[PDB]
Ligand binder design. Sequence first.
Ligand SMILES: CC(C)CCC[C@@H](C)[C@H]1CC[C@H]2[C@@H]3CC=C4C[C@@H](O)CC[C@]4(C)[C@H]3CC[C@]12C
Ligand SMILES: CC(C)CCC[C@@H](C)[C@H]1CC[C@H]2[C@@H]3CC=C4C[C@@H](O)CC[C@]4(C)[C@H]3CC[C@]12C
Lengths: 196, 196
Amino acid sequence: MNWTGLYTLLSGVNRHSTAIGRVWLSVIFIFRIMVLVVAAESVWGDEKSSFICNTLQPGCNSVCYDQFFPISHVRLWSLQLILVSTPALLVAMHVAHQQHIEKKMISGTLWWTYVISVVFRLLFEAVFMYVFYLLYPGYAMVRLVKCDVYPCPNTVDCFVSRPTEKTVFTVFMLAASGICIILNVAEVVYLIIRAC
Amino acid sequence: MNWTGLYTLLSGVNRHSTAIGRVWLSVIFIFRIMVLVVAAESVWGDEKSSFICNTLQPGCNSVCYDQFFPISHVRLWSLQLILVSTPALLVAMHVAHQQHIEKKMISGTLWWTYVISVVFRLLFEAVFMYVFYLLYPGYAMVRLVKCDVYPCPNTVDCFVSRPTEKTVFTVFMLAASGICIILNVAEVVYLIIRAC
Ligand SMILES: CC(C)CCC[C@@H](C)[C@H]1CC[C@H]2[C@@H]3CC=C4C[C@@H](O)CC[C@]4(C)[C@H]3CC[C@]12C
Ligand SMILES: CC(C)CCC[C@@H](C)[C@H]1CC[C@H]2[C@@H]3CC=C4C[C@@H](O)CC[C@]4(C)[C@H]3CC[C@]12C
């Protein structure tokens, strides 16, 4: 777990990444993973089991939970991290492949593919930010929700588990994601400026 | 409870009633009352409380019982006895009123009103027989019924209490009612024949 080994691993052995991309982006990425790990099973572990509705209708609990939580926040963030990390993984594999072929026997190609990688990383961050806004308007969760989907008769009151703690972690993850967007834009601008 | 007192009470102090109307009709009427008394609270006492359906839907028990038993057999027979007994009560009151006014101070009127009374008694018997057939086709009740009325989901199985015992008493009451119809027709025919 040598510091130089961890730095080499996270940097992806890329010769075009700048200081921000090799230090700040990696740290914020680690921060999001650690927050997600400590908050996934602990806070969102009983999201559905503890979800109850004030009714005697069989199946109203499950249908109301599905109505109000089409996809859990933890899974949404997990997908966001995987999708955001994919272009970095592709660049690392491409660099390793180039090292392999040159050992068996370019700089502009590496520069261009890195820039495209950062652009796609920024694009994925923006898309997931918009999707999160679309599914869950606002940032705070409420204790009581009004559910009227079939088979629930009329409108029933359903209660969410730990809405305040989930709100706190939602703010943390959203703030970290916003910082990643800002750093990605700065990285793109810095690369373009240095290219001239 | 002197026998002559009971006979005078049941006959209605009528001078036109024949032997069948004063003996057989009264006995069958007493028979129906006694059968109804012993079978009302004992057999049909738990008709709704013991009625259960194989479902978790709240309210499906009550709605299914109402669907399959719009009116209980005991109440239907109770109404039949009251309605059948009404023309006899009217004739008895009219006879008493005539006695009252003559004491204060006709035979054809008494004869005609008695004949009309028997005709209406026969008519009420026939109507209730038809209504019983209309609400409960056949004579035997079944242990299991298929109920699909709202709010019950799809079709549910509901179970009736004491369907065999209720079937036995249904046959008894129906047979007694049929005998009353036959005796009433015989009474009308005999009166018409004797009138000539
Ligand atoms: C600058 C930032 C974005 C760098 C992010 C680096 C991420 C994308 C890289 C760094 C090291 C990578 C890991 C290296 C090895 C493995 C083992 C493999 O069997 C599963 C994937 C897994 C666990 C990789 C997941 C992606 C990973 C964590
Ligand atoms: C030949 C057949 C049909 C005769 C039938 C006689 C029936 C209709 C008559 C005979 C005596 C009557 C009862 C005489 C007195 C009373 C008391 C009153 O406060 C309520 C009704 C009640 C209880 C009457 C109900 C009707 C009754 C039972």
